[PDB]
Symmetry: C2
Subunit: 152 residues, 2 copies
């Protein structure tokens, strides 16, 4: 029954990590900061079905901003407005989390906050020199909910 799947999903929030349920970067729907909000761009955005779109610059691992489809409400597609312009105005916060972060805590961070999206990253000491932050993908609240209510 569902009750069992949920409880089991709850217990596993202790062991499991954001890396276990995240959406790997290569599968993430992203957009470039050098984008122009013409009718076409905005069409491709509203068509994706996504509410939150990560904004990258140069590489996909260089997530620099967060686009909400809600931010395109007053954008006129005939102004051919740059995305930089909007992201500068709204400037929604970016939240980063580590790959080893447990799901029970991530959920807790998600609940206190309007943030339901976080960038999963890890530490790459595998240099070649200075260790740095490597982006792995993004995790959203729906990702942990699913690991709770799914059957297993």
């Amino acid at each position: 029954k569902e009750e069992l799947n949920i409880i089991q999903g709850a217990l596993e929030l202790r062991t499991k990590t954001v890396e276990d349920v995240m959406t790997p970067l290569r599968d993430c729907f992203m957009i470039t900061g050098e984008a122009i909000l013409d009718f076409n761009t905005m069409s491709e955005i509203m068509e994706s079905g996504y509410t939150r779109i990560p904004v990258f610059e140069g590489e996909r691992s260089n997530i620099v901003d967060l686009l909400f489809v809600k931010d395109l409400a007053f954008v006129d597609p005939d102004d051919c407005t740059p995305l930089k312009t909007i992201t500068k105005f709204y400037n929604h916060p970016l939240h980063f989390v580590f790959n080893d972060t447990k799901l029970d805590a991530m959920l807790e961070e998600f609940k206190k906050g309007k943030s339901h999206l976080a960038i999963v990253q890890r530490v790459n000491n595998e240099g070649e020199g200075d260790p740095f932050y490597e982006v792995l993908g993004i995790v959203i609240l729906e990702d942990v909910i699913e690991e709770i209510i799914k059957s297993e």
Copy 2:
């Protein structure tokens, strides 16, 4: 501990009904089928944050269609397109549900499908004539998610 919050929330699925967690009609965000997708109407839709919007005709309790913001992707707001044009074309299915439906059952119906929205209605034995289905409001997947994960 969220673990216990989730577990207890899961225990309450067998007792509580869709009527207990639904969004009552008076608080639902809707739109008339007589609408026109001019720039203003689009903005209002795109600003609510709602990804799914019920369509009513004449009376709010008379829900006849379902609008997805995905359906607005290729609409040019300068064309001033009837909402009927889009609802007729896409023709997204409507799902109804009874108020006495337990949540564990409602959760089950949401998983086995794409529909995460359902119109709650009850049986009106209070005629004045033949009985009928009376619309109470809408319930979505997130409504039962909240019930499970909310703090108590």
